[PDB]
């Protein structure tokens, strides 16, 4: 068909990862259980027991600190019976933090990313002169995968005049450096080139997605007599499984670009953005 290649250096980060574990419900009921214990503490356990004053403000603050590790100095309530009650709440906090990290490790071991574009129908290709430094793409002229674009997207074919590489080999060299950011070529050579690159540094949009699917052929002379004999031969190879042998012998690569297992990441300013918005 027609396919798209990308650098994969950017990919997509995962923002708002802090709220990925737990749920919106557990936090809401966490506050009400944060205060029911404190309200009974001042009014029942401390006031109805012997041995200046333990105000309600200290009770909510003291019971809060243990949730996110005790680091602020505070004054504990008196009374022998009031000691055990706080210890019961403390054991809630120890497990509460322990499970949160354990669940957080599950999400970042099997993280899934999203490609930076959706296809040729995305606005980044249709109308590029509206953004940050413009998107780059280009294709080798004098073929089909450029005749097809010259009929349907004649608006954006003008923008591709300056970017015109001179073959697949030269363009894949300049795609990593940064001269251009996208490559548009028939989806049977890009898949092989993607699957035969060291380090899996280049991935194809959609992981095997074609955009105007037309096969190959053997362009016999018109009005020939061989056409009915050749066709039966090719339709025969599929039945015997011979073609499945040739595809394994020649069209096989080493990089398994289908898998999206990202080998960790270094979180940057943009990645942890939701946390700072809570601070604001």
């Amino acid at each position: 068909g027609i396919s798209v290649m990308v650098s994969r250096s950017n990919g997509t980060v995962s923002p708002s990862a802090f709220l990925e574990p737990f749920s919106a419900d557990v936090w809401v009921m966490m506050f009400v259980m944060l205060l029911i214990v404190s309200a009974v503490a001042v009014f029942v356990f401390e006031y109805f027991s012997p041995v200046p004053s333990f105000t309600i403000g200290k009770a909510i603050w003291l019971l809060w600190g243990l949730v996110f590790n005790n680091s602020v100095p505070v004054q504990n309530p008196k009374g022998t019976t009031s000691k055990i009650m706080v210890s019961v709440w403390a054991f809630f906090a120890v497990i509460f933090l322990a499970s949160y990290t354990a669940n957080l490790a599950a999400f970042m071991i099997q993280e899934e990313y999203v490609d930076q574009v959706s296809g040729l129908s995305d606005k980044k290709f249709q109308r590029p002169n509206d953004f940050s430094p413009p998107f780059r793409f280009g294709t080798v002229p004098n073929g089909s995968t450029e005749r097809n674009i010259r009929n349907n997207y004649a608006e954006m074919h003008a923008y591709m005049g300056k970017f015109n590489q001179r073959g697949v080999d030269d363009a894949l060299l300049s795609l990593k450096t940064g001269k251009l950011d996208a490559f548009i070529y028939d989806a049977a050579v890009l898949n092989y080139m993607a699957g035969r690159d060291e380090g899996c540094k280049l991935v194809t949009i959609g992981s095997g997605k074609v955009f105007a699917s037309t096969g190959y052929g053997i362009a016999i002379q018109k009005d020939s007599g061989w056409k009915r004999q050749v066709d039966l031969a090719i339709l025969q190879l599929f039945g015997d499984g011979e073609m499945e042998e040739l595809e394994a012998l020649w069209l096989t690569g080493i990089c398994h670009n289908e898998k999206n297992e990202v080998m960790s990441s270094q979180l940057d300013i943009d990645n942890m953005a939701g946390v700072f918005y809570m601070l604001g």
Binding site: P21, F22, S23, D25, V26, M33, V37, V40, V44, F48, S49, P50, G65, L66, V74, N76, G79, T80, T81, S82, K83, I84, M85, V86, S87, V88, W89, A90, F91, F92, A93, V94, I95, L97, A98, S99, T101, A102, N103, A105, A106, I109, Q110, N148, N151, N152, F211, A212, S213, T214, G215, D231, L232, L235, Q236, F238, G239, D240, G241, E244
Partner: protein, 414 residues
């Protein structure tokens, strides 16, 4: 779909408000084996009938749809007298003369191509296996899972063992209350902020050094082990392509079928090496691809081998199932016609022009690629209130314990 009263199709609209296009199908009713067949009008629509209308305008002809007689696809079988073999079903009616254009999903292979003429494929497919998706399951109801119950009792016992020994060791050294020292050990384990008593003698100070480090090892290991039950919990029971060993040598605990008189039977007999498992299929082949899918949902069938363009639409809407394997026989569809027909050239050019314009990439959008259920993106286990109950009841059910402690503490006073 059955027709409405007065013989007309029911009015309808799509999600975007476009009125769907429908034709009139005159086909058999209640085509059960051993039953008479009665012809009644129906209503037909979908992918191909959306394509058929497009051709019928460009080339300017006029159509008259009618469903197949029996309901099969097409194969060659021997007659009783000698072997004057003939075709059957939807493939045979084109040669007889009762139909002139087989607008339907019809794979192209060498057996059929020797009698009729196909067109350029309007969809590229393969063969893949559909198997039942087992329950992902989940093991999180009580927090006593990372450690065995034999250790929490021992660990709690060890707290009282160390705590009591601070008073004996420090007092005998040439002071702090034992009850005060009781909250020292408890404070370390629970990371609480209560307790003020601390050892003073260096004999007791060195004792408290290691116990502080013991609390870190136990809790860190516990929170480390809880990661194991979130990345290791996954079974592995699935078929890997056709070459999976479970498929070569059948066992009575595994059964797998296809649709009778289709292209797959021609595929499984032309080959000769795979002639030991197909013989187990001949006693289980189903009657319709819309029935063998229902049988799998009832656990009466383990595997199903069919076209990859249908099994990946049912696997989305009926998300109880998931498709496994790698495509192993790729051949596109085709609008077959009788050999040496006048229209045989302009049809093959009004299909090659529907690929480039973005048309057949637009029918694909509105019929085959609308999403209803997500897929199995590994085993994501988010935490909800239902999972954690033991912790929530202990804090909720432990507040009444403090009521008892007050009543006995005041009793000791008087």
């Amino acid at each position: 779909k059955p027709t409405l009263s007065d013989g007309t199709c029911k009015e309808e609209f799509t999600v975007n408000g476009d009125p769907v296009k429908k034709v009139i199908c005159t086909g058999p009713n209640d085509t059960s084996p051993g039953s008479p067949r009665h012809t009644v009008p129906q209503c037909c629509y979908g992918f191909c009938i959306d394509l058929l209308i497009k051709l019928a305008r460009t080339m300017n002809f006029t159509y008259e749809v009618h469903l197949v007689a029996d309901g099969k696809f097409g194969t060659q079988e021997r007659v009783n007298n000698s072997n004057k073999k003939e075709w059957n079903g939807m493939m045979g009616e084109l040669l007889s003369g009762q139909a002139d254009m087989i607008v339907a999903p019809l794979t192209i292979n060498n057996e059929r191509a020797q009698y009729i003429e196909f067109s350029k494929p309007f969809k590229y497919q393969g063969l893949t296996i559909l198997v039942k998706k087992e329950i992902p399951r989940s093991t999180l109801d009580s927090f006593m899972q990372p450690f065995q119950s034999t250790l929490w009792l021992l660990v709690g016992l060890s707290v009282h063992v160390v705590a009591v020994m601070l008073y004996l060791l420090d007092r005998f050294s040439p002071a702090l209350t034992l009850s005060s020292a009781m909250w020292f050990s408890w404070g370390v384990l629970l990371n609480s902020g209560i307790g003020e008593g601390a050892p003073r003698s260096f004999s007791a100070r060195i004792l408290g050094m290691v116990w502080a480090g013991f609390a870190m090892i136990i809790v860190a290991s516990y929170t480390a082990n809880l990661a194991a039950f979130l990345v290791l919990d996954r079974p592995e029971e699935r078929i890997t392509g056709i070459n999976d060993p479970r498929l070569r040598n059948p066992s009575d605990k595994f059964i797998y079928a296809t649709v009778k008189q289709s292209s797959v039977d021609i595929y499984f007999r032309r080959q000769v090496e795979l002639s030991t498992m197909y013989r187990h299929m001949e006693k289980h082949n189903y009657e319709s691809a819309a029935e063998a899918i229902q049988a799998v949902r009832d656990n009466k069938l383990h595997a199903f081998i069919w076209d990859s363009a249908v099994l990946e639409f049912e696997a989305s809407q009926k998300c109880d199932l998931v498709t496994t394997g790698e495509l192993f026989f790729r051949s596109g569809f085709g609008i077959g016609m009788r050999k040496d027909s006048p229209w045989k050239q302009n049809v093959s050019l009004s299909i090659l022009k529907s690929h480039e314009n973005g048309f057949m990439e637009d029918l694909d959008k509105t019929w085959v690629r609308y999403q209803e259920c997500d897929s199995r993106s590994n085993a994501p286990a988010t935490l909800t209130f239902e999972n954690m109950a033991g912790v929530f009841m202990l804090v909720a059910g432990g507040i009444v314990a403090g009521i008892f402690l007050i009543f006995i503490e005041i009793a000791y006073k008087r």
